[PDB]
Every structure is written in C-alpha cells, then in structure tokens.
C-alpha cells in the first residue's frame with residue numbers, strides 16, 4: 511500500500527506466532543520490539559537513541575510478517591517505548607520513501 | 610523522488626538561512642534539529658525515545674526547505690545526535706511510505 515504520515519505509520523505484525531502493532535520507522539537502523547518471549551538463542555547488545563543507550567536481546571534470522579509481507583532478519587527486544595520496524599526489515603519488504 | 614532504505618535517508622535541508630543534513634524519519638512525530646541559535650520566542654519541551662528524554666526548545670512556524678520542497682511548522686532544537694525530520698513536516702512535502 512501507500513501510507514500517508516498524517517498519523518503514525520502503525521501496522522500489524524506477526525512474530526513468534528503472535529500479533530502486535532508496530533511503527534514503520536525510517537529513522538531506525540534496526541528493529542526493536544518491547545519485552546517479549548522469543549524462542550532460540552540470543553546475545554546481549556546495546557543500542558542508542560535520542561535519550562541514550564539501552565540493553566537489548568538480539569535475536570538473529572527471526573521470521574516476521576509485516577502487513578502481509580514476510581521478512582527474516584535481526585530483531586532486538588528490550589525496553590523500547592514502542593515497537594519499531596527499522597530499515598533492516600523495511601528493505602526486505604520493499605519499502606521506500608516517496609515524495 | 611524515491612528514496613530506498615539501504616542507507617539512512619539523509620537529505621539536505623535549509624533552515625534559518627543554513628544548509629544541513631537531516632534524516633527523513635517516519636517514526637518521529639516531530640522535527641528535532643541539532644543545537645542552533647534561532648531567533649524568536651520558544652517554549653521548553655521534553656521528548657522521549659529509546660534511552661529516555663531530552664530537553665529541547667520548541668520554535669513554532671519555522672520554515673524548512675527539504676530537497677526543494679518548502680515546509681513550515683514546529684521545530685524542536687536540542688542536543689539531538691542527528692537532525693530529524695518528523696511527520697509534522699514530512700506530510701507537508703507529500704512524503705509517503707510505499708511497499
């Protein structure tokens with residue numbers, strides 16, 4: 511679809527068999543989801559934002575479906591204020607900015 | 610134009626008579642610019658992201674030219690690590706997400 515930005519670009523995603531709402535975030539290098547139980551191994555990582563850095567759990571090669579489009583890649587889980595879909599997965603679903 | 614997301618969506622902007630590089634950021638409700646001394650009144654504000662909140666100065670009705678497209682709206686100024694163009698101005702230049 512084509513998504514205007516008068517409202518937050520929130521979409522439904524499916525990860526680990528569960529549905530959630532997430533923000534398509536072109537300003538995010540990586541995809542960061544709120545605390546949740548994902549299967550598989552993970553490694554600790556740190557990522558920084560406007561307010562500073564947080565500790566996250568890095569899950570690699572995770573299947574995630576974003577508004578009906580499948581992606582497989584890195585998903586970070588931690589105390590983000592909002593579930594964000596970042597460029598690492600936006601590229602996989604073929605997302606571009608247009609004006 | 611169309612902007613792919615393999616790399617950060619950095620574009621040239623012109624504000625307050627100065628040229629700068631800024632991120633087109635669909636995850637940002639508002640526009641946050643690096644420290645700069647702009648004339649006129651302002652109001653204190655706090656904005657939060659990953660890592661917590663930062664203190665910024667809110668200036669209203671500021672003109673910004675983004676890749677030749679003019680926009681005028683609220684601009685927040687503070688110790689952001691990056692110039693961020695948020696939805697308040699992206700809507701005005703007709704920016705959409707597409708996949």
Ligand SMILES: CCOP(=O)(COc1ccc(C[C@H](NC(=O)O[C@H]2CO[C@H]3OCC[C@H]32)[C@H](O)CN(CC(CC)CC)S(=O)(=O)c2ccc(OC)cc2)cc1)OCC
Pocket residue numbers: 533535536537538539540541542557558559560561562563590591592594596634635636637638639640641656657658659690691693695
């Ligand atoms: C190389 C730069 O240095 P740093 O690492 C950090 O620089 C930055 C800082 C911010 C951003 C943009 C930010 N992205 C982000 O957090 O991305 C994370 C995930 O992927 C990583 O990619 C780069 C950072 C990592 C979001 O798009 C926008 N945000 C909202 C969003 C937060 C989840 C929804 C609530 S917002 O900015 O907080 C914001 C809140 C309210 C507003 O209006 C009221 C306007 C803006 C990009 C690079 O310095 C460390 C100290």
